[PDB]
Amino acid sequence: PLGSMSQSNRELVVDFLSYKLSQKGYSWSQMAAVKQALREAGDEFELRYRRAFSDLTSQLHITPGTAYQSFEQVVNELFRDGVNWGRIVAFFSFGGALCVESVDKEMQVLVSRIAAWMATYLNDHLEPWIQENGGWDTFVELYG
Amino acid sequence: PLGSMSQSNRELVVDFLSYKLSQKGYSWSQMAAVKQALREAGDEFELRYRRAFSDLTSQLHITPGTAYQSFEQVVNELFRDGVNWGRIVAFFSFGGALCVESVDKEMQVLVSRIAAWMATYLNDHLEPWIQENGGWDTFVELYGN
Ligand SMILES: Cc1ccc(CN(C(=O)N[C@@H](CS(=O)(=O)C[C@]23C[C@H]4C[C@H](C[C@H](C4)C2)C3)C(=O)O)C(=O)c2ccc(-c3ccccc3)cc2)cc1
Numbered sequence: 001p002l003g004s005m006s007q008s009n010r011e012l013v014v015d016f017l018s019y020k021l022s023q024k025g026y027s028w029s030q031m032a033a034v035k036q037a038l039r040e041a042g043d044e045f046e047l048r049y050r051r052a053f054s055d056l057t058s059q060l061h062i063t064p065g066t067a068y069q070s071f072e073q074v075v076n077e078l079f080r081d082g083v084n085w086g087r088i089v090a091f092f093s094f095g096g097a098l099c100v101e102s103v104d105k106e107m108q109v110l111v112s113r114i115a116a117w118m119a120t121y122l123n124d125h126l127e128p129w130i131q132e133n134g135g136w137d138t139f140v141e142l143y144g
Numbered sequence: 145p146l147g148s149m150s151q152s153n154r155e156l157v158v159d160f161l162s163y164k165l166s167q168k169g170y171s172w173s174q175m176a177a178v179k180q181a182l183r184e185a186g187d188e189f190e191l192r193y194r195r196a197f198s199d200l201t202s203q204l205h206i207t208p209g210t211a212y213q214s215f216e217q218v219v220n221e222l223f224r225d226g227v228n229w230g231r232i233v234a235f236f237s238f239g240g241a242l243c244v245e246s247v248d249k250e251m252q253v254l255v256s257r258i259a260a261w262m263a264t265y266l267n268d269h270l271e272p273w274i275q276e277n278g279g280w281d282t283f284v285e286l287y288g289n
C-alpha cells in the first residue's frame with residue numbers, strides 16, 4: 001500500500017535522477033536547471049572573489065539575537081549600485097556562508113532563520129528586477 | 145497561484161543552502177543527508193563497477209513503447225539473490241543511466257516514466273527490506289563510515 005515511505009522514496013528517485021542528468025549537462029526540469037546553474041554560479045563566484053567575499057562575510061556578526069534588519073543592511077550594500085545577476089549570486093553565496101558559519105559556531109538554530117531572511121529579501125527586493133530581466137530562465141541561458 | 149513565488153523562491157533558497165552545507169559536511173535535514181549519501185554512493189558504484197555496470201545498462205534501452213514489466217524484469221535480476229544497500233545503489237544508478245540514454249536519444253519524455261517505474265519498484269518490492277534493515281538513516285550511517 002501507498003504509505004509515507006512511498007512518498008519519501010519518490011523524492012529520493014527525483015533527486016538522484018536530477019543529479020545524474022545534471023552530470024551529463026541535462027536536467028530533470030526547468031527548476032532543476034535553475035538550481036544547478038545557481039549551485040555552479042555560487043562556486044565560481046566564491047572561487048573568483050575569495051578574498052573580497054571573505055571581507056563581506058566578516059561584516060555580519062551572526063549571534064542568536066541577530067534580526068533580519070542586520071542581514072538586510074549588509075545585503076543592501078551589495079545592491080548599492082543596482083541589481084544584476086552576479087550580485088544575486090553573491091547574495092546567495094553570502095546566505096550560504098552565514099549558514100556554514102552558524103553550524104561551525106554550534107548555532108544550527110540560525111540556519112532556518114537565514115533561509116527565511118533570504119526568501120524575504122528575494123521577494124521584497126529582487127523579484128521585481130528578476131521579472132523585468134527575463135526571470136530565472138534568462139539567468140540559466142546567460143550562465144550556460 | 146497566490147503562493148507560487150513563495151513556493152519557488154523558497155525551493156531555490158533551500159536547494160542552494162542544502163548544497164553549501166553539504167560541501168562542508170553538514171546537512172540541511174535528514175532527507176538532504178539521505179539524498180547526498182545516495183548521490184555519492186551512485187558515483188562510487190559507477191566508478192568501482194564501470195565494466196560490469198556497462199553490461200547491465202546494455203540489457204535495456206527504453207523506447208516510447210517499453211512497458212514497466214521489461215524494466216521490472218531487469219531490476220529483479222539485480223535482487224534475485226537478496227537485497228543489500230549496494231544492490232539498491234546499483235538499482236538507482238541503473239535508472240539514472242536509462243534517463244541519461246533517453247535524453248541522449250532525444251526522448252526526454254521517457255525520464256518522468258522511468259522515475260515513476262523506479263518509485264513503483266521501490267513500493268512494490270523494497271519497502272519491507274528497507275524498514276527491516278534500519279531505514280534510509282542506517283544507509284546514511286553505514287555509507288558515512
Ligand atoms: C558566477 C559569477 C561570476 C562573476 C561575477 C562577478 N560580477 C560580474 O561579472 N558582474 C558583471 C555583470 S553580470 O551581469 O553580473 C555578469 C554575469 C556573467 C555570467 C552570466 C551571468 C551570471 C554571472 C556569470 C555574472 C551574468 C559586470 O559588472 O561586468 C559581479 O556582478 C560581482 C558581484 C559581486 C561582487 C562582490 C564580491 C565580493 C564582495 C562583494 C561583492 C563582485 C562582482 C559574479 C558571479
Ligand SMILES: Cc1ccc(CN(C(=O)N[C@@H](CS(=O)(=O)C[C@]23C[C@H]4C[C@H](C[C@H](C4)C2)C3)C(=O)O)C(=O)c2ccc(-c3ccccc3)cc2)cc1
Nearest residue numbers: 185186188189193196197200228229230231233234286287
Ligand atoms: C557505493 C557502493 C560500493 C560498493 C558496492 C558493491 N557491493 C558491495 O560492496 N556489497 C557488499 C555488501 S553492502 O551492504 O552492499 C556494503 C555497502 C558498503 C558501503 C555502505 C553501504 C552502501 C554501499 C557502500 C555498499 C553498504 C558485499 O557484497 O560485501 C554490491 O553489493 C554490488 C552490487 C551490485 C553490483 C553490480 C555491478 C554491476 C552490475 C550489476 C550489479 C556489484 C556489487 C555497491 C555500492
